[PDB]
Amino acid sequence: DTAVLVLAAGPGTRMRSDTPKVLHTLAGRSMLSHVLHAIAKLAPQRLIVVLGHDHQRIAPLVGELADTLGRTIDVALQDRPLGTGHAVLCGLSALPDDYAGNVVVTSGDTPLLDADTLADLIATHRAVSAAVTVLTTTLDDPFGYGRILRTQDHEVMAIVEQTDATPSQREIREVNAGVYAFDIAALRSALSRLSSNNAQQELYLTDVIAILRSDGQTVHASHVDDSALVAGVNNRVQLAELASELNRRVVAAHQLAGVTVVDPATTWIDVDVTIGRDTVIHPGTQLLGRTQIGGRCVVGPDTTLTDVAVGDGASVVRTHGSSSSIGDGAAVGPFTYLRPGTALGADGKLGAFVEVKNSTIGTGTKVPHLTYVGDADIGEYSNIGASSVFVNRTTVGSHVRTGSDTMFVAPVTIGDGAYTGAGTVVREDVPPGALAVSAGPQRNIENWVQRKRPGSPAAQAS
């Protein structure tokens, strides 16, 4: 029986942002959504988020996350950020006065924390019957973290903040994860003896360690070897660091499952993208949102995709694209732009310097050069000539061949098997199997250059 509190009420000063810290993203999810997903998995009885300026967030919690995760998540308010000890107090008010379960406390700013780390904490805390168990790690650069102070016997004495004591002695490398389990009555008790006479002048949660030690209670510290699972984010340097470690691990999972990623350091893959066996991802690539790739694909160099579905055996090279689908064996790129609502059928082709927006394109159809296709629908085994524009719902049949430089002034229907001359402005329906034209005839004006440009190419018309 446990209640979990997420502390998300701080000002996030060092982010230098008008966006609340806990809303800052990595791998496709805000830090708060990473944290709330880990806990939901653990499925505790009670789950509580402590908010300050409550409206720019209260909305995303529950409103997007408790429904999605299919559980209740309570919001508790802390009006002024008096400290992590004061934040816990406010979290406790959402529990009944007679609450008897355990209390787990975590920060909204530790995004790699996972269910398992949380479940072992709870299990250690029960196993040793502790008043407080705290997760610790060891780090080469310990700055900003509260340091674990141990007695002569390796007993946890206290936690000391960066700003406070450990004067010169900050050299300590065993750090506080900011992740705890507590007996409730020992928690209510220690919090009532908190004072704010310290370098930050705040009610620190960390002080509770030394206070329960004084009442000869049991304090257990529990070392997490994989430091990244408990790393904090207080600034944008630490954010990009952890984003990058999370990326390495998501890439590694895909590799081990049968995906060749040529260059992991420049391959960004959101948590949620799926990618099938034997596809190849070339450097300089981001796969974002709910993107899905089948097997045997080539994801070429310099491709950005957000919510794009790509079937088996398709090629997607230097493409910028979102909210679109690309069929089996289709070819896309290089230098191609897909806007939302693009659907390209199996074995379809979108070539170099082509943009498609809100359009349907049938199996084995080809748009290879320098063309814009918007709000149009196109059948199968058709061919759209180079340097053309769908001007905006235009309907094009199957096995159509349109000429280079045709303009389609919406709405127009071009029948199956129809053709269009090069340089045609199409303004009316074209029956099946007709040829549509508008360009006037070629007229050659002899010796024009000798007369009108008497230098350069004037030799050699000579």
Place this chain on the structure above:
Amino acid sequence: DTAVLVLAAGPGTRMRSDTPKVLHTLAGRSMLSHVLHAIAKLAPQRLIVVLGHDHQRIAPLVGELADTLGRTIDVALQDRPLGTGHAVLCGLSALPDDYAGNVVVTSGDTPLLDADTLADLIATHRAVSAAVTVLTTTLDDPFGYGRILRTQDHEVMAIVEQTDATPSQREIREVNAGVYAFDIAALRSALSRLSSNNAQQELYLTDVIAILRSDGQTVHASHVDDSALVAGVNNRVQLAELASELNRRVVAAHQLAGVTVVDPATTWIDVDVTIGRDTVIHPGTQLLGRTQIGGRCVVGPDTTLTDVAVGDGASVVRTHGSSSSIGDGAAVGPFTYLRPGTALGADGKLGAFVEVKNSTIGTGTKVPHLTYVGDADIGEYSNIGASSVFVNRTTVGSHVRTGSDTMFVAPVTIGDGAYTGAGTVVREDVPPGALAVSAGPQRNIENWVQRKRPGSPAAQAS
């Protein structure tokens, strides 16, 4: 007198691939082709590759590599993958029963191994008169490697596999390279006493170390400090790692020879690309295949080239290109696509949003904007107007100036010094020094917008 065996018969389970492991590529060559190139250099008397599912490969060996390397390479078959000890046995059947030379054994999955490492092995093995010499290295992460066990006196006792013994004690960091020299009779002998009662239930080559130790033979282990030269690839994580270390070294060689590479971490250069003094390679660049760059070039950001020859003093910026040539002082990019058979002469120019396919383009000719050129040939000091298309063999002369938006419906010949109006559809030959036109005349319809769009721009026609 030595015979070299390459073991390439395993199932490659952890690659999760329908492509045989040994065919997986890095820096432009399969692991098997890296390995076979190193040995060819050493030039042993006999060279033997052990294959299993023999047809998807037997083809590339000899068929591409023994001819290319100009030596004989024998294939020996091992039908079922009973173990690296069973693989060696099958390799031995390609040697005469009375064979008396030394036997070198290596894996098809150690691609950075070089002639020199191999030559020192053979020399140590002769020098110390050993029954077996084995190459070892030391590693921070030793997982998957067989561990070297040494007596109290640093004598090699045995090799132990990851799956087997070293229970907790796997902490050992001295690893087996999988690269050996053997006396033949001691090799035939130890292999005949191999059993498969082990965690994998296989006939391990590694066991031969302990067996010859038991017959008080000489076992020499030889430490390779540069660990990368003997690193194995069992999965796609290890593949991308080693691909990346090989890349760093190929980049470093080019830098030391007089090439500025702005960002090595994002510059991929195949082994085989040549690059001349004082050129500059900007970030996000891959130079692949048999690509060649002269001196004083700029290789701009985000350029991909496969089998592209670029002369001195040329510029190639954000270009995607293959099987093509670019003359001295030519400018290409940004946002340019070259398809096979593109030849651009000295001081030529292909600009932004231009594609060229199977075309010849003469010295000092310019195609700067938004145009497609396919299966066409073009003389010197000509100028192809923006937003044009060569529709498919078209022939264009020297000092031609064609108008913006001209369509060339193949086959058509445009004489030297000829011009074309803007918006011309060219369907017939254009004599030298003629002007070709087809666009009809401008007609202005006054106050059209007041009448037909009574809002917006209707003020201010006001």
Place this chain on the structure above:
Amino acid sequence: DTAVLVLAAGPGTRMRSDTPKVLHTLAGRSMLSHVLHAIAKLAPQRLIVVLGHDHQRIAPLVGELADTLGRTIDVALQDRPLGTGHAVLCGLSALPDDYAGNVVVTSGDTPLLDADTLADLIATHRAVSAAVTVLTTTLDDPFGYGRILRTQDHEVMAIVEQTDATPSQREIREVNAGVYAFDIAALRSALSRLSSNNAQQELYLTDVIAILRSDGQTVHASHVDDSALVAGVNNRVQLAELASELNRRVVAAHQLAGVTVVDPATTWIDVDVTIGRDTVIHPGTQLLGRTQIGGRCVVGPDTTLTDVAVGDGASVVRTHGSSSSIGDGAAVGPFTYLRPGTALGADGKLGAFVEVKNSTIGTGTKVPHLTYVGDADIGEYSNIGASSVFVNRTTVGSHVRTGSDTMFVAPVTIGDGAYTGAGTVVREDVPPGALAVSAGPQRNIENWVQRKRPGSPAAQAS
């Protein structure tokens, strides 16, 4: 009272370059300009640069840097590169014979050295009253550096060059920064006893350490913990290394000030670029020269900008651009090319496959597709149709709407609120609120395909 000498007279052999080593760039400035900027800040009384082949440089010093830094910088000549000790001698000739200040000596090839490191050196040198103080650091890879040799008591004895002594014993990891302070008379004195009997056969500055030790003078060595501030560049491998460390630090400064940089390892930012709070820089991006970004911008993936000003809240995605301005809330990209003299007004739009050169574009104007705009000026809330070309000063009014595939043959004036049909060649002024057209009428030729292509699309016109 100090005089500072920069030694820049060497041949730079290992750069394998026809460009003098000291002119090689990182983060937007030559190594010499990094070095001269650090010293200028310190503001010494005298500042002297030692040059050899004097003309390819003497020009940039003073000529660009002493004016810019608003101080005098003297050039002293050393005709042949006899050594760093001989270089100092030549530097001294630019001081009066009776000069009595201190003498600071540094290399033109240590580009991260900063004013502060220099000011603490001078202060240590005064504080301890030393004859020579030398800056040292400690390094994992010590190759090419002169090693600090200390007595049994940690007293600096001598400096030994890589090429010379420390035979096997080169294992020493405490290195010479090449940055010194000297008493002038002790400097004149030690230099007069220099000989060139050594592995390089040169007059080494380093020998002066041992010589003043012999005259029982005071030799102080001063350890710099941040090794990068005193790292040298003798080859292009070391150059790209230090360029990359300088980049990491410039990125970090921007992050800590309120800029999200998704991927630091692939974000190049010149020293001098300014970037405002809450903007987001996506991977694969270079911001170069005097580029300026406001707040709330998105700098999308694969953007290169050199001297580009971007206001607040603008979007710049996969754009290659230079010497141009982009207004507040404007959208640019993806796949856009800006050439010098491009000015786009607030809330303007340049879309995919658009190039703009030397053009003015007013507030809320839109050029979204496949168009070239050169030497043209365009008012506000206008719309330039897809696949169009400004052919070269063309003037376009406000609230104009031009049709897809319009060619504007410069010089032409299009009045406010005017329209243009699709496929129009505009050769004469268009009054305000007129419609301009030239395309002829659509003609449909029935059953053409059955007759002229009797296969394929011939079914199904069937």
